[PDB]
Amino acid sequence: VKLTDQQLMADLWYQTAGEMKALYYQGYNTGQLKLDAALAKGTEKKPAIVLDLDETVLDNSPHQAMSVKTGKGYPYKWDDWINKAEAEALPGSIDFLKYTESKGVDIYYISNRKTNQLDATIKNLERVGAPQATKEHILLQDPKEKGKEKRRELVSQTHDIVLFFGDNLSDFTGFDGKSVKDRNQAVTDSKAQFGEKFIIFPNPMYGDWEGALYDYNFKKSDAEKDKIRHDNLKSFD
Amino acid sequence: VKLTDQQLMADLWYQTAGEMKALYYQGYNTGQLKLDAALAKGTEKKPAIVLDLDETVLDNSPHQAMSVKTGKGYPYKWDDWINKAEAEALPGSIDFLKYTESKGVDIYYISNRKTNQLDATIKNLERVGAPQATKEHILLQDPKEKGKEKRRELVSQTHDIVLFFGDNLSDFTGFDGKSVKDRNQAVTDSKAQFGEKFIIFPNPMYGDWEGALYDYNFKKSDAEKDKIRHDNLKSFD
Numbered sequence A, B: 001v002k003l004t005d006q007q008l009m010a011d012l013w014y015q016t017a018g019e020m021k022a023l024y025y026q027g028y029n030t031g032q033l034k035l036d037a038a039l040a041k042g043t044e045k046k047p048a049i050v051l052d053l054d055e056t057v058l059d060n061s062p063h064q065a066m067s068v069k070t071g072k073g074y075p076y077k078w079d080d081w082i083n084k085a086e087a088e089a090l091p092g093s094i095d096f097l098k099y100t101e102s103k104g105v106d107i108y109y110i111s112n113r114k115t116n117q118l119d120a121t122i123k124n125l126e127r128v129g130a131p132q133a134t135k136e137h138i139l140l141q142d143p144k145e146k147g148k149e150k151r152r153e154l155v156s157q158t159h160d161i162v163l164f165f166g167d168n169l170s171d172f173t174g175f176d177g178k179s180v181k182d183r184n185q186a187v188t189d190s191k192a193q194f195g196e197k198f199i200i201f202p203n204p205m206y207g208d209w210e211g212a213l214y215d216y217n218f219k220k221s222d223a224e225k226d227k228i229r230h231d232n233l234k235s236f237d
């Protein structure tokens, strides 16, 4: 079984579809409207926004396409890709970030890139013209650190975080390590937050949605993942 | 050779990912905000909204999952699926539509379901509780006519259409029959509209994004389609 072939359409959409680009504009347009509203309401502490990087601000889809062509899934040559520091900015992202900066609002890029990839991440953020591309504002994941809540909470000590941007539910608080059924119910329960506080972007290529299917154990064979993937489809009879 | 296998991850995300559900909530949450805003400012003609049905209001992903499991591509069992009239509503859609009706706004379901599928479509819409599920409000595709602009224009003769909802760029005005290059540039050109007048939903399973890759000629071989799909991915060096 060529597992990587199973991602082809998802990758192709993400890389070529105008619809995908439109969804990125819709997210950043909505985020800017809500930033303005949050600034007009006012804050107790200095305002901040928090964004994920991969598939939120930086487009890593060329690595996923490399996996389709080679048949070798992530993280094969992921560090090689990160070190190249040539990911393009996703649609609307840079204009929104520059607008946020112009308003005096602090930005924190909270990303599960590893702390030892900081320098390459700064390089990529500089290449695309992302504001505040510094160690102070780029909060990467420690070895053995689970999730992003520690970094979210550190930011909240000194800022009021008015918006979160991400492609993965775990880019928002309260979606860590849940089963498919439980994370899906949590979405329903927090339905009012989406497009309000939590700004979501489309990523059918990879993420916690896939990891949840494997009980977050990625040490599964290609055949085992293939079976789980097939078993979790809901087919019409 | 097995083109349906390449849809698996796209279908699995659409069916299982809480992120997909969040994007639908974000879309409809934004729709309600923009509807209220438009009504508050007033209109010339009676207000309307236009929605697409498939992958906008109604979830047909069980048919797509079936294609993957059986390995049998479109049109296998599509009309049978339509006639079963058992698609679930997409997240946030029905509450939004009930709200819209209650504000005195007319809803028009402009959908490329065939005119002989009108009875089944009414049945499915009644089942999920969509309002205004009648021939006067469900505007299906005439086999002589391509695209939806004629139906959009007709509605616009008596109403001021304040919002459009879809998963396909051709559910909005200005995206008919364009190359990938041209349709993607048109998104850029119309970037301000998304989340404002055009409310977009994520569908990595199928659409004009795929048709455009084939220069809208689906009578290509699977070999040709497979080469086209592979050739349009962008990998890194």
Ligand SMILES: [Mg+2]
Residues within 6 Å of the ligand: A052, A053, A054, A055, A056, A166, A167, A168
């Ligand atoms: Mg991400």
Ligand SMILES: [Mg+2]
Residues within 6 Å of the ligand: B052, B053, B054, B055, B056, B166, B167, B168
């Ligand atoms: Mg549709």
